[PDB]
Amino acid sequence: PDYKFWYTQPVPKINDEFNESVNEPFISDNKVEDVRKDEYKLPPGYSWYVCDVKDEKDRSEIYTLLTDNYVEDDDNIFRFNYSAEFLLWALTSPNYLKTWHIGVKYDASNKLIGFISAIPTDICIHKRTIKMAEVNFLCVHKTLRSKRLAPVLIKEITRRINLENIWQAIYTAGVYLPKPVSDARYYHRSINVKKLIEIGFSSLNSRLTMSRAIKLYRVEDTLNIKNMRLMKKKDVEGVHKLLGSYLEQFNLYAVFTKEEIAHWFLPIENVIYTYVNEENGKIKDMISFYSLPSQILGNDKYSTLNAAYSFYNVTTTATFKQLMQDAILLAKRNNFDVFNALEVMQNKSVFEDLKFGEGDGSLKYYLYNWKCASFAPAHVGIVLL
Numbered sequence: 001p002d003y004k005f006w007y008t009q010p011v012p013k014i015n016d017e018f019n020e021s022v023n024e025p026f027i028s029d030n031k032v033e034d035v036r037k038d039e040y041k042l043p044p045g046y047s048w049y050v051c052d053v054k055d056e057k058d059r060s061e062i063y064t065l066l067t068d069n070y071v072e073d074d075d076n077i078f079r080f081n082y083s084a085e086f087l088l089w090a091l092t093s094p095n096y097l098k099t100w101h102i103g104v105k106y107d108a109s110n111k112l113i114g115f116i117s118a119i120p121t122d123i124c125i126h127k128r129t130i131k132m133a134e135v136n137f138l139c140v141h142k143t144l145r146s147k148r149l150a151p152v153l154i155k156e157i158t159r160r161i162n163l164e165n166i167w168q169a170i171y172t173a174g175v176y177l178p179k180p181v182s183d184a185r186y187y188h189r190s191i192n193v194k195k196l197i198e199i200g201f202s203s204l205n206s207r208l209t210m211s212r213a214i215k216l217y218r219v220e221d222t223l224n225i226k227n228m229r230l231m232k233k234k235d236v237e238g239v240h241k242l243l244g245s246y247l248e249q250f251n252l253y254a255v256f257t258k259e260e261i262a263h264w265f266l267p268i269e270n271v272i273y274t275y276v277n278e279e280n281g282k283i284k285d286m287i288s289f290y291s292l293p294s295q296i297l298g299n300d301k302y303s304t305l306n307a308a309y310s311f312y313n314v315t316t317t318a319t320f321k322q323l324m325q326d327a328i329l330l331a332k333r334n335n336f337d338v339f340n341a342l343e344v345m346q347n348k349s350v351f352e353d354l355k356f357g358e359g360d361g362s363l364k365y366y367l368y369n370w371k372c373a374s375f376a377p378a379h380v381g382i383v384l385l
């Protein structure tokens with residue numbers, strides 16, 4: 001309601017509205033020379049720590065911080081449990097900066113209690129392509145909440161990003177902040193029906209008994225696209241063209257280089273899954289989803305919901321519904337308990353037919369130091385991890 005920190009930032013106020021003809025920074029003509037070279041002050045006993053995510057132990061420290069203190073669902077059934085290998089993948093995209101992986105340590109115990117990260121990427125917003133920082137994994141230890149640490153983390157990473165002559169950022173959050181460019185409800189498609197019911201996430205009733213639910217969400221183990229296969233390095237050029245052509249229709253997408261295609265789509269077990277359909281030497285269809293377990297809080301039987309998240313999907317030889325049906329089948333074949341997707345790109349058009357259930361909240365999309373018209377989530381063409 002007050003937004004005492006955010007109203008000091010170059011972001012729209014809660015009731016700011018810009019028309020289609022506006023697509024520019026809040027603050028332009030920025031000079032790297034003018035960026036502060038001193039780190040932001042922390043409370044005494046706390047220190048900045050540049051994390052080396054390629055070091056296993058530094059990476060484990062981030063993993064522990066997030067495992068115990070990161071995002072929980074609105075009902076506190078779940079907490080995200082990003083794997084250490086996933087964090088490596090998420091944070092070492094091409095041209096990434098290790099100095100954008102910022103930790104705060106409590107000196108007395110030498111333990112990480114705060115973290116924020118960013119990676120650089122070209123973001124096309126309303127047909128204008130801007131080098132941006134993609135901010136993610138902001139986390140403050142549960143014991144230090146509501147002490148205004150997050151503004152310090154946000155301001156410090158803003159400074160480090162500005163030092164690289166980058167003045168815009170993209171980020172997402174479940175909380176409402178000034179001010180979303182788009183707002184995206186999330187949906188789920190049950191796969192391990194019995195498990196989702198036992199943990200308390202899915203519901204039954206007289207019409208949907210346990211056995212009828214199991215039958216309803218059972219899938220045929222046959223791809224609509226017969227030759228969908230795991231992506232290999234030979235497909236990077238093909239995927240780059242297919243996805244790149246698909247994404248230009250949207251109001252907000254990342255302009256991937258081939259190097260970025262290789263990093264973000266070549267498969268890593270329990271991290272990122274991409275399947276392709278090659279015809280006549282061309283990649284004509286692609287499915288991708290990443291692995292993001294939710295820890296199941298307090299649950300005696302299960303400690304982990306193995307969830308797959310829809311990443312990027314393009315079809316030219318099938319319908320989008322058949323493609324996503326295959327996406328669900330491919331996630332099941334890989335032992336995921338649930339398939340999750342946002343109402344971005346074409347996704348909403350298949351949610352009813354493919355038996356998705358609507359979730360309880362939404363993911364908001366944001367830009368930093370950019371004013372433009374907002375848009376319905378079907379015009380969003382980017383998924384942040």
Ligand SMILES: CCCCCCCCCCCCCC(=O)SCCNC(=O)CCNC(=O)[C@H](O)C(C)(C)COP(=O)(O)OP(=O)(O)OC[C@H]1O[C@@H](n2cnc3c(N)ncnc32)[C@H](O)[C@@H]1OP(=O)(O)O
Pocket residue numbers: 002003004005006007069070071072133135136137138139140141144145146147148149150151154157158161162166167168169171172173174175177368369
């Ligand atoms: C050009 C370069 C630009 C780079 C910067 C681009 C912007 C990047 C911004 C970051 C993108 C992150 C993307 C993701 O990672 S989204 C993931 C966010 N992380 C979690 O939800 C994990 C669980 N929660 C926590 O760890 C803490 O609660 C956090 C760290 C979230 C808040 O800490 P705490 O609870 O101890 O509060 P405080 O007293 O320190 O801070 C209070 C202030 O913080 C504002 N707040 C609350 N939640 C968020 C949020 N998700 N994004 C931005 N701001 C947020 C809040 O409105 C208030 O400001 P104001 O209301 O008074 O104004």
Ligand SMILES: CNCc1nnc2ccc(-c3ccc(F)cc3OCCc3c(C(=O)N4CCOCC4)nn(C)c3C)cn12
Pocket residue numbers: 071072073074078079080172173174186187188201294305307309338340341342359362363384385
């Ligand atoms: C974007 N960067 C990370 C990030 N930051 N904030 C958020 C908020 C939402 C989401 C989110 C995004 C897409 C999606 F499709 C579902 C999503 O969230 C489901 C709610 C949920 C669940 C959950 O209900 N489930 C059951 C089904 O399987 C998955 C786990 N668990 N948690 C821990 C959450 C937050 C990501 N967010």
Ligand SMILES: [Cl-]
Pocket residue numbers: 221222223226
């Ligand atoms: Cl098959």
